[PDB]
């Protein structure tokens, strides 16, 4: 609703939403992440990272080497448009980004960069109205 969406992540390594559509009327957009499971962040942590589809694996790979304290996102990664921190069960986080950083027709991927999670936790985001 509005210029925001909510994605729930669980203990089975899956997002509940696979597609997010950003309305052209939005200048800013907010992504809310809820970890609805009950596992600790050191075992089942989840975040939400947004990049072009092409940068997915490169960003996830560098992110794994950043560490948990860095939310598994390489500090100042120029390929990451937006990202939340890594959360454990019972928690949540939000990230707001400038819609101008998004282009029509372009393909964007949101995925979890916690080690090994990217291959199963990913979705598509695009500008469309």
Residue 43 or 58: the one with the smaller Cβ distance to Cu ion is 43
Size of the site for Cu ion (CB under 5 A): 4
Task: Give the pairing of strands 4-9 and 28-35.
Answer: parallel
Residues with Cβ within 8 Å of residue 74, at least 6 apart in sequence: 59, 62, 63, 65, 66, 80
For residue 109, what are the β-bridge partners? Answer: 51, 124
β pairing state of 49-52 and 82-83: antiparallel
**Which of residues 26 and 36 has its CB atom nearest to Cu ion in the complex?**
36
Site membership for Cu ion, residue 117 (CB under 5 A): yes
Give the helix/strand (H/E) hosting 20.
strand 19-22
By the rule CB under 5 A, 83 interacts with Cu ion? no
Nearer to Cu ion, 56 or 117 (CB): 117
Binding residues for Cu cation: 46, 112, 117, 121
Binding-site residues: 46, 112, 117, 121
Q: Which of 7, 31, 112, 125 binds Cu ion (CB under 5 A)?
A: 112
Residues 34-63 that bind Cu ion (CB under 5 A): 46
Give residue for tokens 């509940």.
16
- For the chain, the maximum distance between any two Cα atoms, rounded to a whole number of angstroms, is 39
Using CB under 5 A, which of 29, 108, 111, 114 touches Cu ion? 114
Closer of 46 and 74 to Cu ion (Cβ): 46
Q: What residues line the site for Cu ion (CB under 5 A)?
A: 46, 112, 114, 117
């Amino acid at each position: 609703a509005q210029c925001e969406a909510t994605v729930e992540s669980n203990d089975a390594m899956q997002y509940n939403v696979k597609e997010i559509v950003v309305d052209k009327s939005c200048k800013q957009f907010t992504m809310h992440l809820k970890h609805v499971g009950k596992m600790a962040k050191v075992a089942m942590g989840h975040n939400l990272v947004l990049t072009k589809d092409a940068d997915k694996q490169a960003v996830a790979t560098d992110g794994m080497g950043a560490g948990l304290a860095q939310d598994y996102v390489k500090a100042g990664d120029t390929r990451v448009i937006a990202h939340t921190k890594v959360i454990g069960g019972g928690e949540s986080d939000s990230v707001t980004f400038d819609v101008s950083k998004i282009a029509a027709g372009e393909n964007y991927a949101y995925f979890c960069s916690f080690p090994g999670h990217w291959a199963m936790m990913k979705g598509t985001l695009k500008l469309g109205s």
